[PDB]
Amino acid sequence: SAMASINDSKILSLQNKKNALVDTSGYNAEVRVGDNVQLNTIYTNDFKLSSSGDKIIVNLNNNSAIYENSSVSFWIKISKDLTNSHNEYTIINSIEQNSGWKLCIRNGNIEWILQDVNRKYKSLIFDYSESLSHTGYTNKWFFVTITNNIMGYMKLYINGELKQSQKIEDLDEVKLDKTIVFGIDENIDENQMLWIRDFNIFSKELSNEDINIVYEGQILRNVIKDYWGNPLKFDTEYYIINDNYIDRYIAPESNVLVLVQYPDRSKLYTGNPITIKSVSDKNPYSRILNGDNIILHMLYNSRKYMIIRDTDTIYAECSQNCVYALKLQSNLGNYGIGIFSIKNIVKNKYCSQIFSSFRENTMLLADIYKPWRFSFKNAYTPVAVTNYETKLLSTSSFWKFISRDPGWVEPP
Numbered sequence: 057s058a059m060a061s062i063n064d065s066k067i068l069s070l071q072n073k074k075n076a077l078v079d080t081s082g083y084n085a086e087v088r089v090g091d092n093v094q095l096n097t098i099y100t101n102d103f104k105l106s107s108s109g110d111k112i113i114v115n116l117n118n119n120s121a122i123y124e125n126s127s128v129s130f131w132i133k134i135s136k137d138l139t140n141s142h143n144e145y146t147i148i149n150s151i152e153q154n155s156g157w158k159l160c161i162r163n164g165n166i167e168w169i170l171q172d173v174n175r176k177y178k179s180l181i182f183d184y185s186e187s188l189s190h191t192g193y194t195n196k197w198f199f200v201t202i203t204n205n206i207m208g209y210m211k212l213y214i215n216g217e218l219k220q221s222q223k224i225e226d227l228d229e230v231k232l233d234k235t236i237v238f239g240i241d242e243n244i245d246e247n248q249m250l251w252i253r254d255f256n257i258f259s260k261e262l263s264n265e266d267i268n269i270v271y272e273g274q275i276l277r278n279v280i281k282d283y284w285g286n287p288l289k290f291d292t293e294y295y296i297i298n299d300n301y302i303d304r305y306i307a308p309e310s311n312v313l314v315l316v317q318y319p320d321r322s323k324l325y326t327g328n329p330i331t332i333k334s335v336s337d338k339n340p341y342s343r344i345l346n347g348d349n350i351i352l353h354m355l356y357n358s359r360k361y362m363i364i365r366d367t368d369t370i371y372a373e374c375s376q377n378c379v380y381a382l383k384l385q386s387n388l389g390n391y392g393i394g395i396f397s398i399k400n401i402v403k404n405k406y407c408s409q410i411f412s413s414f415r416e417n418t419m420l421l422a423d424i425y426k427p428w429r430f431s432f433k434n435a436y437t438p439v440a441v442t443n444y445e446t447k448l449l450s451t452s453s454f455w456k457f458i459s460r461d462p463g464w465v466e467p468p
């Protein structure tokens with residue numbers, strides 16, 4: 057079992073147990089967590105570095121210099137205001153004297169550095185920002201993996217994909233720091249913060265296959281994700297967008313839902329917040345899982361409506377290639393016509409597909425239609441279509457849920 061071989065090689069694993077961050081690898085590293093450091097806010101094993109002063113100090117146990125291969129893996133999510141800074145910040149520091157490793161952020165890039173006793177160093181750089189493209193990873197969870205073969209290469213993977221390699225075999229002795237410090241020493245502002253979760257070190261060089269198993273394991277494949285890669289939750293406001301129309305928000309026009317172009321593509325939090333309600337009554341704010349039944353409530357001009365499927369097809373009972381537009385109802389309640397189900401889809405994720413099984417099996421997608429009974433006007437229209445097997449991989453069927461998140465602040 058690869059996954060057992062993987063886990064057996066862990067020599068540090070920071071995980072939250074009884075509300076403390078501790079090493080659960082079996083090796084008993086000392087973990088000193090700053091009083092103000094927030095733990096377990098999004099993911100069980102996460103921590104927030106939200107300030108200078110916020111620090112976590114790890115002191116590794118007795119098992120001078122690097123003697124063996126190794127890998128380091130964690131997820132990271134870096135706020136917009138931190139990503140947009142042109143400065144450089146050390147985030148994780150494990151250099152003593154002048155040798156060891158460190159992870160830095162600089163101008164929208166993450167950078168891993170390995171430095172020998174003469175201060176010769178090699179770096180791995182990844183531009184996670186892509187100039188703040190709502191297409192990049194600004195404020196989105198992504199999975200980092202560094203692997204080291206001391207008689208070979210140091211490699212940087214992102215979400216299981218190799219991004220850069222550098223020979224390290226030609227460095228002189230790299231002394232190994234028994235201390236690892238998480239935290240930003242620089243003088244950061246209020247909106248500059250980042251989160252890390254599932255930080256692990258392995259005593260071997262993980263293979264790309266091994267890396268993909270860790271990635272798939274820690275992404276939580278049965279948990280639906282919001283736009284940032286956080287778990288999607290009930291009773292939480294989201295701006296829901298279609299993958300094909302990312303600068304359009306959902307809105308009712310004459311009680312037909314359509315997609316309206318953002319007046320300003322740079323502002324994410326635009327439109328009518330939709331709250332997801334559990335059919336089965338779960339604890340408030342509980343995570344939404346793959347396959348859950350859900351009900352969608354829109355806040356529109358300060359009143360709550362339930363989103364429901366149209367009773368009749370769009371060019372109108374129907375069996376063959378039916379297309380239904382959507383609408384709003386002010387009566388909240390468990391109505392089959394307003395029950396949907398939500399499923400994960402997998403490289404490009406953090407998006408979801410939505411289905412309804414009321415009377416006919418449909419999938420929600422967006423395209424151009426004439427959704428008004430008394431008009432031939434076109435509109436980008438979210439619709440529930442039958443016979444959707446050939447559309448199961450169409451981006452028109454992918455939906456994202458943008459939550460107001462602390463790592464992405466928009467002027468008031």
Ligand SMILES: CC(=O)N[C@H]1[C@H]([C@H](O)[C@H](O)CO)O[C@](O)(C(=O)O)C[C@@H]1O
Nearest residue numbers: 310311312365366367368369427428429
């Ligand atoms: C004017 C308007 O909004 N008409 C809508 C009607 C009325 O909501 C319904 O007849 C009850 O009055 O329902 C639909 O036909 C439907 O659900 O199939 C869609 C149509 O867009």
